[PDB]
Specification:
The chain has no helices and five strands. It is an all-beta fold. Strand 2 and strand 3 form a beta hairpin. It is classed as endocytosis/exocytosis.
Length: about 70
């Protein structure tokens, strides 16, 4: 592609504590994992981290701004 900065990607939220899945439709993360947020119920958010998809109470996470001025994991 000749031009176009890309990168209009979905919300991410970093997990604050590890939480295994329980239901089928529950997400599984570790402490300080980064989850691709994808939808938001009342408190439970759908998001994807390490090939799952699933739902999780957002209370276990925080929204992040950008990955800004810290790493550049190329």
């Amino acid at each position: 592609g000749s031009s176009g900065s890309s990168g209009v990607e979905n919300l991410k939220a970093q997990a604050l504590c590890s939480w295994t899945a329980k239901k089928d439709n529950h997400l599984n993360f570790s402490k300080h994992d980064i989850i691709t947020v994808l939808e938001q119920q009342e408190n439970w958010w759908f998001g994807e981290v390490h090939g799952g998809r699933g739902w999780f109470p957002k209370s276990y996470v925080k929204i992040i701004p950008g990955s800004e001025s810290g790493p550049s994991s190329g």
